[PDB]
């Protein structure tokens, strides 16, 4: 929006929209956790706390009135700059098809991580608990994908004594499922196998994890809370070339970890 | 069209239509690169060179007026030469079911060879650089089908990280496809274990490529530059025999390499 | 248009418009081949070959398939850059009748010395040959006026031959026609002469050619092709100051010589 002050971009149109789609699409495939957890907002560009539902005590014991502070979360607001040439834009509207956009894709990368480490990992600064630290629900098993398939079969009885419902997916590290699919036969899919202990759901393989996750789909459980969602907007001129940048708010919350399994 | 002076061929619409018919089937079958890269136009006939979108700067440093020269693709121009007998012709009319045209298919061979060349390998005197010319982007891998599936997980892997999307397909020599195929069991078909790792694709088996290719088709990335399209017209007399043409212009730009990934 | 940013520059309609003005004039003033070649277009801003018509075989003489390149002229893109002062232009909303815009005036006559000598002399890395190199066809005459009429005389009678017709125009430098003015009387003014031997026709004094022409207006002979016309835009900020530049796209092609004839 007008916070972006993209009408004082030097640029026309069609390289905003240049720019925007291969944005879309490089966050598209390197947004991970969008793929799993909910989004509720966008509530920006002004929101800057979620609660919590809670009240700290700060009063003494022996208070007449007792009184606290009631809790939130506070909203990351996240910054990047891209710097584009201009002589190299404008051979858009002069026919070229292909236009570079190289330092867009890397800081766009850059901050997808961002985004996937605060979720997976969380932050402190923040006081977000991340996937990965729910240690308390943790399955060992061995390394093979028999192994792997008794472990699903464990993480879905456990999902049924604690009344956990719905659609299943595993978010795996790309390795360790190619080193499954290459370390037994072969004369069935070891995908079929795992889509059908993992009764109708999927896999998902994901850099971002070493080992892996279960996870219910069947909604509510985690949610991602969306103030400013991935925007870019302008700074300055360099002069010869232009100054961007892209921006969000966001937090994260595990509502639910009885929806989530972690795996070795 | 009228260039073609197909009117002044000493033929009936009957003989026409039978040289038409087999010239389609062979250059469907032979013309591999059309099933992958998109074509624009026609532009023809006068269309003559395709727009790049650059300038290339002439002017010295310190020249008050500067200027330089808008750059573009030349369209390749092609032109080969049948000769059939009359005698074998006219005893269509005649009745006769099968007609030899023999040369026809001989040289309509030749044509797609040569488009396929320009396609695959491109052509230096055009300044066409081929698919098989992007070095860049290439994936060192064994020589097995398990090693073969997981080079295409690999490739899915890159498409990811440069944000390629799309259905996928998995362009392969001949031999080496057979070789897969006969190299191990056999207790699952290898094209069904490649169609999921190359997750809703396809294989296209193609003789003018050794090794073997990896490309999205979610369009707009590979294109064919279409001014005349192939068409058959109508030289001179022998005089038993009538000597034709075939002609087209084209030229081929790969717009998007990220949306390309070569296999060893 | 919108690649020439004039929405971005610290200015109102009204500098736009008073620069716009003052470049109309300067150019109608100093272009002098517009005033005698055809105008195609324009085609741009896009546009980057003219083609020629032409195909280059670079087959081989025993190659089955023959294939070349089909052939076209390149436009010509120049830039040039103004700087003009701020404080200036701001004095027009001020009420100031008289805003100083030298240093446009100097680069558009500079800009339109360039078209002139494209047009006159060429090119040769652009592969654009002038009307002045046309040295086939050329006249050898006295130097007073007499010699000057039986020169035009003898020219319509080649355009005779050559089955060229159409009103007639004469191009000479002003230093020579000024020196034939004052050589002789006097009792006839020279100029009628001319106009009755050049019938029906045209004198024009261009300071950029040396001698003389003379061409036939039939039309369709000497043709401009324009991409993108003259046109101001924008650049940067100094800041105290703002720079434009003038741009334009364009090639030339003279189709029938036999429509012009040099003079000594």
């Known amino acids: 929006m007008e ?3 993209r009408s004082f971009a030097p640029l ?11 944005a879309r699409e490089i966050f598209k495939t390197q947004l991970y956790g ?3 957890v909910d989004v509720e907002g966008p509530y920006g560009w002004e929101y800057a ?12 014991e022996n ?11 506070p909203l990351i607001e996240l910054r990047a700059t891209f710097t584009l040439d201009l002589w190299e834009l404008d051979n858009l509207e002069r026919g070229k098809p292909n236009v570079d956009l190289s330092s867009l894709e890397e800081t766009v ?3 997808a991580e961002f985004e996937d480490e605060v979720i997976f990992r969380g932050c402190e600064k923040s006081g977000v608990k991340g996937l990965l630290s729910f240690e308390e629900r943790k399955i060992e098993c061995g ?15 456990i999902f049924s004594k604690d009344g956990i419902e719905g659609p299943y997916t595993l978010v795996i590290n790309t ?6 699919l290459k370390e037994e036969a072969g004369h069935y899919p070891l995908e079929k196998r795992v889509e059908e202990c993992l009764r109708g759901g999927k896999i998902i393989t994901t850099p971002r994890i070493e080992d892996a996750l279960v996870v219910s789909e069947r909604g509510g459980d985690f949610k991602l809370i969306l103030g400013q969602d991935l925007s870019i907007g302008y700074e300055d001129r360099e002069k010869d070339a232009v100054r961007l940048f892209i921006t969000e708010t966001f937090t994260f919350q595990v509502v639910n970890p009885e929806a989530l399994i972690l795996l070795k």
């Open 34 to 36: 969008r793929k799993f």
């Open 143 to 157: 390394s093979t994908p028999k192994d792997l398939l008794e472990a699903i079969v464990r993480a879905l009885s």
């Open 175 to 180: 390795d360790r499922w190619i080193n499954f």
């Open 109 to 111: 990368r850059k901050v």
């Open 3 to 5: 916070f972006l002050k």
């Open 49 to 60: 706390a979620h609660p919590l539902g809670e009240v700290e005590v700060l009063s003494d």
């Open 12 to 22: 026309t149109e069609k390289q905003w929209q240049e720019i925007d789609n291969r």
């Open 63 to 73: 208070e007449v009135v007792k009184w606290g502070l009631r809790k939130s979360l």
